[PDB]
Amino acid sequence: VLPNPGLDARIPSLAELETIEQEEASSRPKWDNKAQYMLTCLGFCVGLGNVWRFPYLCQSHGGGAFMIPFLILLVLEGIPLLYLEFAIGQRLRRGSLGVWSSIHPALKGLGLASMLTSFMVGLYYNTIISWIMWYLFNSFQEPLPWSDCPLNENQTGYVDECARSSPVDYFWYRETLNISTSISDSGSIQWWMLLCLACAWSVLYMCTIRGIETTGKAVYITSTLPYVVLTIFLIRGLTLKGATNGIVFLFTPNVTELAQPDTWLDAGAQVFFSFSLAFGGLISFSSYNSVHNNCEKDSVIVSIINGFTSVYVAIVVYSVIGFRATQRYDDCFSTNILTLINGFDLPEGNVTQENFVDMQQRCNASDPAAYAQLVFQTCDINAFLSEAVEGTGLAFIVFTEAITKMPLSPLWSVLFFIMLFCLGLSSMFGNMEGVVVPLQDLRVIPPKWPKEVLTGLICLGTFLIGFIFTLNSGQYWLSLLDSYAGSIPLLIIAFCEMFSVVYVYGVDRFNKDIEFMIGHKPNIFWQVTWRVVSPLLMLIIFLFFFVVEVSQELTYSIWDPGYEEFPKSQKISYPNWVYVVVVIVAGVPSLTIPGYAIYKLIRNH
Amino acid sequence: PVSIWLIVFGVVMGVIVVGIVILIFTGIRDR
Numbered sequence: 001v002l003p004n005p006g007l008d009a010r011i012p013s014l015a016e017l018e019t020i021e022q023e024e025a026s027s028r029p030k031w032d033n034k035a036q037y038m039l040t041c042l043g044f045c046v047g048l049g050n051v052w053r054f055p056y057l058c059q060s061h062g063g064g065a066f067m068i069p070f071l072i073l074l075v076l077e078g079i080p081l082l083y084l085e086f087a088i089g090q091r092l093r094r095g096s097l098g099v100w101s102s103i104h105p106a107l108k109g110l111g112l113a114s115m116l117t118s119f120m121v122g123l124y125y126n127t128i129i130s131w132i133m134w135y136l137f138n139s140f141q142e143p144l145p146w147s148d149c150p151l152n153e154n155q156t157g158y159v160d161e162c163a164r165s166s167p168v169d170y171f172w173y174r175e176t177l178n179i180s181t182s183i184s185d186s187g188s189i190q191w192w193m194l195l196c197l198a199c200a201w202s203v204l205y206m207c208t209i210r211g212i213e214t215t216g217k218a219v220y221i222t223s224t225l226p227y228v229v230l231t232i233f234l235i236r237g238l239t240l241k242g243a244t245n246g247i248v249f250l251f252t253p254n255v256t257e258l259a260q261p262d263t264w265l266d267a268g269a270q271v272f273f274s275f276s277l278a279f280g281g282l283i284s285f286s287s288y289n290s291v292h293n294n295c296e297k298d299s300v301i302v303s304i305i306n307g308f309t310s311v312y313v314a315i316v317v318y319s320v321i322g323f324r325a326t327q328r329y330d331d332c333f334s335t336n337i338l339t340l341i342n343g344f345d346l347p348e349g350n351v352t353q354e355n356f357v358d359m360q361q362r363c364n365a366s367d368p369a370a371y372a373q374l375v376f377q378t379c380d381i382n383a384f385l386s387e388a389v390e391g392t393g394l395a396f397i398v399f400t401e402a403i404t405k406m407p408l409s410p411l412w413s414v415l416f417f418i419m420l421f422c423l424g425l426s427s428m429f430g431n432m433e434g435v436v437v438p439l440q441d442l443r444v445i446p447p448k449w450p451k452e453v454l455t456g457l458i459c460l461g462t463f464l465i466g467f468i469f470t471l472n473s474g475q476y477w478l479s480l481l482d483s484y485a486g487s488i489p490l491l492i493i494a495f496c497e498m499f500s501v502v503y504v505y506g507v508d509r510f511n512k513d514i515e516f517m518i519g520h521k522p523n524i525f526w527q528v529t530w531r532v533v534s535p536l537l538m539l540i541i542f543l544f545f546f547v548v549e550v551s552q553e554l555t556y557s558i559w560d561p562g563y564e565e566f567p568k569s570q571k572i573s574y575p576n577w578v579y580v581v582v583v584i585v586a587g588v589p590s591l592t593i594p595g596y597a598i599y600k601l602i603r604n605h
Numbered sequence: 606p607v608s609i610w611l612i613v614f615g616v617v618m619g620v621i622v623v624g625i626v627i628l629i630f631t632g633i634r635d636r
């Protein structure tokens with residue numbers, strides 16, 4: 001609809017497409033099976049955000065109902081977008097930067113914004129896998145290292161911050177991270193973490209070495225395994241003590257939370273991360289298929305499994321939170337029992353849980369001034385089920401504490417950390433496909449130097465930039481970039497893909513070309529959401545961002561062991577030079593989409 | 606006496622570099 005000239009003789013033509021696949025068998029890779037393509041697309045949508053990000057948002061935002069919100073927004077943003085992304089790579093036969101430079105070559109910023117976004121997400125997601133395989137190496141020993149406090153020098157008492165905090169909370173901040181008190185104070189490289197980082201990048205270079213003919217078998221294993229383990233964790237989780245008391249708590253509807261501008265944003269920004277939209281990897285994976293492959297049936301099957309898995313991991317996660325909260329309620333209520341037995345001389349099995357409150361008043365009516373020194377607790381469930389931990393603590397200080405109280409402790413910890421590893425790995429494959437393929441269409445290296453050499457300089461180049469998160473303050477740097485980065489770029493890049501296919505390429509040329517592949521020109525549901533609904537629905541997510549950014553009082557959490565009233569929380573209000581980092585990681589992937597479009601329109605004219 | 610997390614690192618870091626070697630090998634080979 002927008003008048004761009006010369007669209008033909010820049011893209012392949014429709015009558016020429018039946019001859020192009022009997023010559024792109026050379027000089028272009030190809031899938032072996034159809035299941036090799038669906039398993040590497042499920043692994044790119046499902047990873048590490050269904051574990052510690054979705055089940056918190058499913059409950060904290062009026063769970064049981066948030067399902068509703070998350071659903072609608074899905075079959076509205078997600079479906080339409082994913083479909084249009086699968087059908088644009090199969091037709092134009094290029095990667096991510098080659099598709100948007102084929103249609104109006106003055107655009108070209110959507111390819112450079114997808115490469116900068118895939119570089120920054122895959123930079124810090126390879127440090128989370130670095131932390132995960134550190135907890136995997138510290139398995140294979142029956143007293144796990146996060147099970148008991150160490151002794152200090154004289155072997156008479158514990159270490160001081162292991163006694164005020166928890167031993168698990170001590171293994172993360174002092175024996176894994178060696179964290180500092182601020183983001184300003186940084187130290188050395190912390191060798192162990194560095195070795196682990198090396199291992200992670202090395203394991204990543206072995207799987208994605210020769211492009212797509214290695215990540216095939218890789219995807220197979222790294223895509224099934226995760227599922228089987230997740231299952232095994234369901235029939236163990238639903239048996240322990242306190243599951244079905246953490247499943248009910250997840251699915252309690254609170255309809256007041258639906259009328260909130262902050263609910264529909266993170267429900268909207270999870271859909272763009274429950275899938276892998278606006279990343280540039282799903283277009284490069286779809287471009288290897290046959291020309292008559294059904295891409296309408298693939299986008300429904302991929303989105304049904306992604307909507308079913310996000311509920312399925314939340315059942316497994318909140319079964320373990322329900323077991324940990326029932327255990328902490330019983331090891332609290334047995335100490336309120338133990339106080340009066342040690343003060344009023346009663347038999348052992350005397351004064352259980354059924355008779356606590358009536359035996360409170362039998363003692364104070366027997367003899368006063370002996371109840372006044374008694375310290376009791378006000379501990380109760382829905383206060384042990386209601387901690388707001390999120391993002392890394394749901395696996396390193398919450399899930400791994402409930403594993404130590406199970407029967408076979410060093411076996412449920414090996415099975416738990418190899419699964420997370422697998423998830424991370426599949427997501428990594430995705431992001432790597434995202435940064436290598438646009439770096440070949442730019443031709444930064446000569447057409448010598450085969451596929452082993454370009455991937456080796458990406459895995460070694462992103463390794464040296466990953467030294468930031470190995471410092472003492474390296475966990476404050478990783479909690480900074482994540483959110484911001486992701487969110488902003490994702491939304492913005494996602495809007496201009498829906499715009500430049502419908503109004504620059506033309507939705508009438510699109511329909512014809514699609515029909516040429518499958519038959520049966522798409523329904524009234526596809527024509528409505530492509531044209532009016534999903535571009536409008538992606539603007540109110542972009543409008544709600546600058547509503548919740550201007551009033552949330554941007555802060556961050558520190559540890560600070562030498563601090564009065566220590567183990568509660570802390571928020572100490574980021575320094576003024578950190579806005580340089582926020583502008584850099586969130587702004588310049590957003591600004592290369594207009595920035596190249598202004599440069600190309602003034603170089604010619 | 607062995608710092609048990611080192612030796613599990615060792616048998617993992619052993620497999621990856623010999624997994625890489627053979628890789629590049631066959632690569633350049635059929636190349």
Ligand SMILES: *[C@@H]1O[C@H](CO)[C@@H](O[C@@H]2O[C@H](CO)[C@@H](O)[C@H](O)[C@H]2NC(C)=O)[C@H](O)[C@H]1NC(C)=O
Pocket residue numbers: 062254255256257
């Ligand atoms: C259901 O969701 C509402 C929405 O936030 C929760 O509400 C608030 O309660 C706090 C009390 O700490 C007030 O300061 C807020 O003003 C309330 N919000 C509104 C919009 O009224 C409520 O807690 C949730 N229900 C339950 C049982 O937790």
Ligand SMILES: *[C@@H]1O[C@H](CO)[C@@H](O)[C@H](O)[C@H]1NC(C)=O
Pocket residue numbers: 153154156
């Ligand atoms: C604790 O250890 C220190 C040396 O680290 C020693 O001087 C002190 O006497 C010890 N305390 C006790 C109670 O043994």
Ligand SMILES: *[C@@H]1O[C@H](CO)[C@@H](O)[C@H](O)[C@H]1NC(C)=O
Pocket residue numbers: 178179180187472
């Ligand atoms: C980090 O650990 C080293 C010993 O491994 C210690 O000397 C140093 O004080 C720790 N860093 C901080 C900030 O405490």
Ligand SMILES: *[C@@H]1O[C@H](CO)[C@@H](O)[C@H](O)[C@H]1NC(C)=O
Pocket residue numbers: 347349350351
């Ligand atoms: C607790 O002590 C009272 C006092 O004699 C007794 O009647 C009751 O049976 C005891 N409870 C149990 C479980 O033994």
Ligand SMILES: *[C@@H]1O[C@H](CO)[C@@H](O)[C@H](O)[C@H]1NC(C)=O
Pocket residue numbers: 361364365371
């Ligand atoms: C015993 O102590 C409780 C706790 O404050 C109090 O509520 C109760 O009234 C006391 N009993 C008497 C007889 O005052």
